[PDB]
Enzyme design. Structure first.
Site, PDB file in Angstrom:
ATOM      1  N   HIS A 297      -7.325  -6.604   4.455  1.00  0.00           N
ATOM      2  CA  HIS A 297      -8.505  -6.554   3.609  1.00  0.00           C
ATOM      3  C   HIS A 297      -8.317  -5.516   2.514  1.00  0.00           C
ATOM      4  CE1 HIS A 297     -10.683  -8.423   7.158  1.00  0.00           C
ATOM      5  NE2 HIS A 297     -11.001  -9.221   6.154  1.00  0.00           N
TER       6      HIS A 297
HETATM    7  S1  FES Z   1      -8.073  -2.372   5.636  1.00  0.00           S
HETATM    8 FE1  FES Z   1      -8.508  -3.612   7.396  1.00  0.00          FE
HETATM    9  S2  FES Z   1      -6.523  -3.748   8.321  1.00  0.00           S
HETATM   10 FE2  FES Z   1      -6.689  -1.852   7.255  1.00  0.00          FE
END
Ligand code: FES
Ligand SMILES: CCCCCCCCCCCCCCCCCC(=O)OC[C@H](COP(=O)([O-])OCC(O)COP(=O)([O-])OC[C@@H](COC(=O)CCCCCCCCCCCCCCCCC)OC(=O)CCCCCCCCCCCCCCCCC)OC(=O)CCCCCCCCCCCCCCCCC
Ligand SMILES: CCCCCCCCCCCCCCCCCC(=O)OC[C@H](COP(=O)([O-])OCC[N+](C)(C)C)OC(=O)CCCCCCCCCCCCCCCCC
Ligand SMILES: CCCCCCCCCCCCCCCCCC(=O)OC[C@H](COP(=O)([O-])OCC[N+](C)(C)C)OC(=O)CCCCCCCCCCCCCCCCC
Ligand SMILES: CCCCCCCCCCCCCCCCCC(=O)OC[C@H](COP(=O)(O)OCCN)OC(=O)CCCCCCCCCCCCCCCCC
Ligand SMILES: CCCCCCCCCCCCCCCCCC(=O)OC[C@H](COP(=O)(O)OCCN)OC(=O)CCCCCCCCCCCCCCCCC
Ligand SMILES: CCCCCCCCCCCCCCCCCC(=O)OC[C@H](COP(=O)(O)OCCN)OC(=O)CCCCCCCCCCCCCCCCC
Ligand code: HEC
Ligand code: HEC
Ligand code: HEM
Ligand code: HEM
Ligand code: HEM
Ligand code: HEM
Lengths: 146, 55, 295, 284, 19, 17, 285, 284
Positions: free
Chosen positions: A96
């Site tokens: 993400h």
């Molecule tokens: S930003 Fe969600 S896996 Fe690290």
């Protein structure tokens, strides 16, 4: 006495506190630098911030510069977040794009929570950083009467 | 005339029983084995180490 | 109800006529501070015993059931014990139960929470390395004739010759304290073998005494816990003795007070028949007696 | 069930509470309290056994190591193990004293008929539970006891067919038989407690202190006037036992009957056949 | 055994070489 | 579990090199 | 429908969109012994070098797809160490390397999972025990083995050291393509193509599983037998229950006029209640 | 207990045998036998659970391997595990159907209030036993359920102290937790059986086929004229469920609920699948 024994058997006992103390040196670390290591089996980040970035708007005063110690992990799901990639866009994983705002401001996007803090203290002028888990009472703490 | 106060009295009697049977035995047991302590062993070890170092 | 003393069976227990058994306890009194009245372990003695075990005895024997951190708060501090244990190495093949926790795949320095393993991987490897005999594990060595005295007597007692008719083969030695008086251990403790940290002179009896103290300290129900439990026994005995008078008061005095009754019997001749005696009576077991008994 | 006339006392909670709150006990001596001593040590045995069972993993290759580990990392596991063993010893002593007292008092009439069969059945169940625990000890003595029991059981079938496999398997202390015997020990111990409670409720019909009728009609209420005496007599018995044990069993000792327990099944495949010795209650 | 609560219960942190 | 009735019950016979 | 856990990887090709044929999943089918034999051969040659099966023993595939002596030789070609043992209970007294036996668990050549991760660039070759819980089940192995042909879309950014695979989670896998034409040399002379090797290894791996595997077809046959028995017992249960009740309810009733002058002193002053102790002192006073 | 007036019936063996011998049931249909279906599946669950407990070592790092090994080295261990799982499913289905039927019939009346409270208590104990059994699986789903239960306990105790330690030690599935929860599962399942028997005794007071009264006064005897119908109806339900499962759960199946059960608590620690999925009965 009998009830004390019965309850104590179920509640368990902590005989002693395991040793997790560890020291690192950041005296030769240039200002504005990040370093990743492993402490007690977990990846952690040591960062030497600057006054200019601090003014840009928990904190260790390692000399003129400021040092922050965090645990390198994405809280929503397991990661090794990549720092220094976009500053405010830094602290991002592949899964993400929810960044960790270069600091402990937590709320940035879909990812929940922020990188947990680590009990630490800088005990030299700015160089030696000691770290160890917080100690909690585990009474009774006396194993031998004599 | 207050039964729960009497129960507190019984609890106090049990407290006195425990401490009477506990304190003196522990005191004499600890006084008997003062010289058999890790602090004494460490003191002897440190003294010997100092002697060997400045030898 | 009486048993002989010259047949080698102490107090009627038979099976140990092939070795010397009573020296420590029955024939002679070996003094150990932890087995006296209101006595406890000697911290320096246990410390020196662990030093002796680590430098000599641990090269062949083991205490699989137990870990190094038994010595905390009584013999060693955490840091010094950490370095001393780290002086030795361990392998994944050493582990009795190598679950997912032990993720190593090579040798590593030992830690204080590790079980005290011998340098050998297996008992069969120990047997092969030691000429066919296995250096016995010390986890439950308390169940030997005279226990701590057994360890001390085995460590000493290499000063005799076998009698006529007894032959000592190569790789074996004569020791009256071992079963059948023939042991596979060469004499280990020699004068000045171990340099003590506290500067205590290192003689064979001293090292045997220290190592016996350490091994007994590591034991269960007879080590590192017995003295406080004996003190607890003394406290409970004192409590019972002091509570005896009040129990007597309540029970016996109350019964004697309740039994101080006055009884009077009078003549009743008022012309009333005892129909209630003749036509009365109940019995709870009537459901059992009826139909079966006295018909 | 037309041959059954019912139960002497239907076991209900309210009726038990009422019966024990208005139950009366005649004036007696210390020789007539072994039953309540046995009840107390049975309850203590149940509690200590639960405490021990929360730490015993039924694996023969892990039991000694787990027992060692739980001793140093807990404050009361070894205390409860000691309690459990001493409770076994006290149970045997009290039960045998009780049986001897009944035999001497000649309680062999039709009114004592009910209290005898139940007591003997309780004694057999108690011995079976003791055997199960002794096997659970997981030493060389445990293996010898299991082998003896298996051979005696097979003698019933004359050595033909492996009819013992459902409990004893291959007559060794493997994981399957360890699990089966541990669970059986627990369940049969609780059933033992229930059977003993039934036998002790079957006491009130003909309760006497001595063999001589005393002719006294007034008697003490049980809840305080008799329970206090029972607890005090238990304390006195414990004090006498402590004195005798302290002045009779010095530590360390030259020889003991417990040296045969050094051998661990699996770890030590060599057995010292000379010094084969059980506990004193199976010694006869 | 190391799987107990007072021990390293579920081996969340493993004993290994890492590096 | 290698210590079972169908498996090697008590390792009386052991696997050695 | 409604399984929202998996959204990236391809899942339904094996079963929903397309009907892959496996003999063990036919109406009255079973495992192909030759296919399982060749699958274990493929696993031994290539797959077993990284993955392993901790929970399974080599004495599987016995009495079906292999014989005792041939299996003993084939596993004796392998090696095992005491450090491999998950639980040595004094049985494994060897202090060095030795040849594997059919009663040995299928360990990888690595002592530990962390060692496997270090060898394979930080990714652990997943254990094939309980691998039946992957999208598609048995089809997962075949799809993963044959899923190295497609190209990533725009902006995919396949990392260095990884590879593209539609069926793996997040479309990116850390396994280089392993099945190539003629990699194995089958004993029975079957041509060694990539689909054939994938089919054989999938058959073997699925045969190794617990709930679906060597026992399942016989369980299905048993289910068929029990269903037939229930169908056959249907008429007699109907007879007994329903017919008996209908026969019992074939009553005849007659009500007459009684005017003999006797009062209903039993309707009045009558009635017993089992819960009278519950009602008394509480209800209707 | 002046506020207690006794029990409806005594649980004596002779009384129960005579009551079930003389019991008579009115004419009924399929929608009035879910109680007996639940009884029969509880008996099956007891037997299958005992057979399963004779093989489960309570070590969390050995449970999956032991489960795999017992399947290949025996002939019926996996069959009994399958029976246990399907019995849990059928227990939930039958219990909810029974409760729905009672709610539809509007049985919230004073003359069957006693038969309601006992049923709800048995249901709550059933939920607790199911939770313990789910925890016993030693997978990631088991860990999630244990964490949820421990967090609910902590929130009830306001998050102060460690009041959950006696049962849920560190909110995680270590051997200390596993042993205690397994033994609780076993004992509470048997207590569930007893409570179900109590509820089944409390049913005969106001038993109706339908809400509307049927004036028939002749009733069939229970031992054969109604037990045969109950067994036949159970066969009916089993056949229907078999047909439904065959036509609704084909093999192989992709993208299913059971994909969160792959990981083990100890073997797999670096993988936790975010999209959790419980069983269909804890899904609400
Ligand atoms: S930003 Fe969600 S896996 Fe690290
Ligand atoms: C899986 C199947 C489980 C069993 C389903 C079932 O009841 O089958 C018998 C039921 C007929 O049995 P029955 O004994 O005649 O029941 C009617 C009542 O006696 C008629 O008397 P009533 O008025 O007391 O009952 C009316 C109503 C009362 O409904 C309830 O009480 C609902 C509570 C749950 C009952 C079980 C529901 C199962 C499905 C959900 O019952 C129904 O509607 C039963 C059929 C439910 C189908 C869904 O089968 C069908 O109705 C066939 C399926 C529906 C039509 C297609
Ligand atoms: C009955 C025969 C054996 C007696 C001793 C058995 C053990 C203790 C008694 C309880 C049964 C065992 C339960 C297991 C848990 C025990 C916990 C425990 O004791 O902790 C040590 C407790 C608490 O100690 P602590 O809190 O300092 O911690 C102990 C710390 N270490 C580990 C270093 C030792 O202390 C005592 O019990 C002190 C001795 C008793 C004090 C007075 C008691 C009441 C006095 C009146 C008694 C009247 C008669 C009673 C009947 C008996 C007559 C013979
Ligand atoms: C669960 C059952 C609760 C219950 O019955 O409570 C009423 C019971 C009383 O039952 P009871 O009403 O049968 O008792 C009558 C009164 N005596 C005790 C003299 C026979 O308990 C209480 O009311 C006590 C309240 C708490 C007092 C402190 C208890 C410390 C232990
Ligand atoms: C402070 C009180 C000390 C105890 C009472 C005075 C004792 C004086 C004599 C003495 O030292 O007796 C020691 C004796 C135990 O010594 P010993 O027998 O050598 O060792 C145990 C192995 N049998 O001690 C005993 O036999 C006593 C043991 C019980 C503890 C004392 C109880 C006192 C009354 C309460
Ligand atoms: C539902 C409707 C039922 C209606 C009432 C019954 C109607 C009459 C049926 C009579 C005929 C049944 C024939 C079944 C044959 C069968 O499947 O046998 C299985 C087998 C026993 O057969 P055997 O030859 O001894 O073993 C061969 C070795 N592999 O092995 C066994 O039997 C092992 C049994 C182990 C314990 C039970 C495990 C489940 C077995 C049944 C599966 C289906 C369950 C359906 C729901 C209940
Ligand atoms: C018997 C079966 C039921 C037992 C229920 C638990 C009773 C004791 C209890 O509350 O324990 C919880 C907790 C234990 O505390 P602690 O032993 O420090 O934690 C274990 C760390 N190894 O203890 C606490 O959190 C302490 C809370 C206060 C205790 C004092 C009494 C007031 C509360 C009741
Ligand atoms: C390797 C050469 C050894 C060293 C160093 C030590 N011991 Fe030993 N010991 C060794 C063997 C091969 C044997 C077995 C002899 C036999 O014939 O069985 C032993 C035996 C013992 C015993 C006897 C235990 C018993 O089972 O009865 C004891 C008490 C003993 N060893 C003690 C001991 C101590 C205290 C040591 C340190 C000084 C020590 N041993 C060193 C091999 C070796
Ligand atoms: C070492 C080079 C390997 C060989 C030989 C084989 N596999 Fe492999 N595999 C390997 C790794 C390092 C990984 C992990 C990749 C990741 O990103 O997690 C895998 C993975 C698989 C999978 C996926 C399993 C899952 O994660 O659910 C499958 C289905 C698989 N491997 C199959 C497989 C087969 C059939 C092999 C024989 C031809 C085989 N692998 C060999 C490393 C290695
Ligand atoms: C009055 C009933 C009981 C009797 C007579 C009894 C008897 C025994 C005996 C003789 C032993 C062997 C101890 C020894 O080595 O001398 C034992 C051990 C054991 N008992 Fe019991 N027991 C009883 C109740 C229970 C109960 C209720 C439980 C469990 C809840 C239990 C669990 C155990 C366990 C786990 C052991 C082994 C402990 C260990 O090895 O460390 N017992 N029991
Ligand atoms: C060995 C087999 C046993 C027999 C034959 C037996 C028989 C009897 C008899 C005849 C009595 C009545 C005594 C009298 O009339 O004065 C009695 C009393 C009693 N028995 Fe037993 N018994 C046995 C074992 C036990 C056991 C193991 C227990 C403990 C569970 C027990 C508990 C009691 C109790 C509590 C009493 C009442 C006396 C009292 O409370 O002090 N008996 N028994
Ligand atoms: C005789 C009494 C019982 C015993 C001894 C028992 C024992 C067990 C055991 C050992 C397991 C674990 C099996 C395995 O994981 O391989 C288990 C699982 C389970 N039990 Fe029981 N059980 C009993 C009764 C019950 C009852 C009455 C219920 C309530 C429905 C129940 C619900 C469960 C559940 C839900 C599982 C988990 C199965 C799954 O979902 O994978 N058990 N039981
Ligand atoms: C836990 C499993 C349960 C079992 C084994 C069970 C058993 C039974 C049985 C055997 C009956 C007689 C009718 C029949 O055969 O279906 C019955 C009826 C009944 N049950 Fe349950 N029951 C259970 C759960 C519940 C629950 C949760 C309730 C909710 C309060 C409940 C309330 C009732 C009511 C109201 C009746 C009707 C009484 C009558 O018509 O005589 N039951 N149950």
């Amino acid at each position: 006495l009998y009830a004390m024994g019965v309850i104590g058997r179920l509640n368990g006992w902590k005989r002693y506190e395991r040793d997790t103390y560890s020291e690192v040196d950041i005296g030769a670390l240039p200002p504005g630098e990040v370093m990743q290591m492993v402490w007690n089996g977990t990846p952690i980040f040591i960062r030497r911030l600057t006054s200019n970035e601090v003014k840009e708007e928990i904190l260790s005063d390692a000399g003129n510069t400021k040092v922050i110690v965090v645990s390198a992990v994405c809280t929503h799901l397991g990661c090794i977040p990549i720092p220094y990639l976009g500053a405010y866009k830094g602290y991002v994983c592949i899964c993400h794009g929810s960044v960790y705002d270069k600091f402990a401001r937590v709320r940035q996007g879909p990812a929940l929570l922020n990188l947990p803090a680590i009990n630490n203290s800088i005990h030299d002028e700015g160089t030696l950083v000691c770290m160890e888990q917080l100690k909690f009472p585990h009474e009774p703490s006396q194993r031998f009467w004599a | 005339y207050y039964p729960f106060l009497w129960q507190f009295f019984i609890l106090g009697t049990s407290f006195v029983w425990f401490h009477v049977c506990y304190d003196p035995w522990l005191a004499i047991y600890q006084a008997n084995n003062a010289h058999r302590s890790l602090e004494t062993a460490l003191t002897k070890e440190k003294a010997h180490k100092k002697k060997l170092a400045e030898q | 109800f009486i048993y002989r003393d010259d047949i080698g069976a102490f107090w009627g227990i038979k099976g140990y006529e092939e070795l010397v058994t009573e020296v420590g306890t029955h024939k002679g009194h070996n003094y150990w501070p932890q087995f006296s009245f209101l006595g406890t372990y000697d911290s320096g003695s246990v410390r020196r015993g662990f030093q002796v075990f680590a430098r000599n005895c641990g090269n062949c024997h083991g205490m699989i059931y137990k870990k190094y951190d038994y010595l905390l708060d009584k013999a060693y501090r955490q840091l010094e014990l950490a370095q001393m244990v780290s002086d030795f190495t361990i392998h994944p093949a050493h582990q009795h139960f190598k679950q997912y926790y032990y993720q190593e795949w090579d040798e590593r320095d030992r830690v204080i929470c590790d079980h005290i393993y011998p340098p050998y991987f297996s008992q069969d490897q120990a047997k092969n390395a030691n000429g066919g005999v296995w250096p016995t594990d010390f986890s439950k060595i308390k169940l030997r004739p005279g226990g701590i005295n057994y360890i001390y007597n085995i460590s000493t007692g290499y000063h005799f010759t076998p009698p006529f008719g007894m032959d000592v083969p190569k790789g074996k030695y004569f020791n009256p304290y071992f079963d059948h008086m023939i042991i596979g251990m060469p004499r280990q403790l020699v004068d000045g073998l171990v340099d003590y940290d506290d500067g205590t002179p290192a003689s064979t009896p001293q090292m045997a005494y220290d190592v016996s103290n350490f091994i007994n300290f590591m034991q269960r129900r007879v080590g590192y816990k017995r003295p406080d439990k004996m003190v607890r026994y003394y406290m409970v005995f004192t409590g019972g003795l002091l509570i005896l008078p009040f129990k007597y008061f309540k029970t016996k005095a109350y019964y004697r007070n309740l039994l101080s009754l006055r009884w009077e019997m009078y003549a009743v001749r008022d012309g009333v028949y005892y129909n209630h005696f003749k036509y009365g009576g109940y019995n709870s077991r009537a459901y059992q007696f009826r139909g079966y008994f006295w018909a | 069930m037309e041959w059954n006339k019912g139960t002497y006392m239907s076991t209900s909670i309210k009726k038990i509470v009422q019966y024990f709150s208005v139950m009366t006990v005649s004036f007696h001596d210390i020789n007539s309290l072994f039953g309540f001593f046995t009840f107390l040590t049975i309850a203590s045995q149940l509690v200590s056994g639960t405490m021990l069972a929360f730490s015993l993993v039924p694996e023969p290759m892990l039991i000694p190591m787990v027992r060692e580990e739980e001793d140093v990392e807990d404050l009361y596991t070894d205390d409860f193990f000691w309690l459990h063993e001493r409770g076994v010893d006290m149970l045997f002593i009290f039960s045998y004293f009780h049986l001897f007292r009944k035999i001497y008092l000649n309680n062999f009439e039709y009114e004592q008929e009910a209290a005898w069969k139940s007591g003997v059945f309780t004694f057999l169940l108690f011995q079976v539970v003791v055997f199960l625990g002794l096997v659970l000890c997981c030493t060389h003595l445990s293996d010898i006891t299991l082998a003896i029991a298996a051979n005696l059981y097979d003698t019933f079938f004359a050595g033909k067919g492996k009819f013992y496999w459902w409990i004893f398997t291959s007559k060794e202390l493997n994981t399957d038989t360890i699990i089966r015997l541990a669970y059986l020990h627990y369940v049969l111990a609780f059933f033992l407690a229930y059977l003993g409670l039934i036998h002790g409720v079957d006491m009130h019909y003909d309760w006497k202190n001595e063999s001589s009728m005393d002719g006294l009609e007034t008697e003490m209420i049980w809840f305080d006037e008799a329970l206090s005496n029972e607890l005090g007599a238990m304390i006195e018995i414990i004090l006498i036992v402590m004195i005798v044990c302290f002045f009779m069993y010095p530590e360390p000792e030259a020889l003991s009957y417990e040296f045969f327990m050094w051998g661990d099944i699996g770890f030590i495949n060599d057995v010292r056949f000379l010094s084969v010795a059980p506990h004193w209650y199976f010694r006869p | 055994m190391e799987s107990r609560s007072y021990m390293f219960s579920l081996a969340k942190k493993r004993s290994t070489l890492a590096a | 579990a290698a210590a079972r009735a169908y498996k090697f019950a008590l390792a009386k016979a052991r696997a050695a090199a």
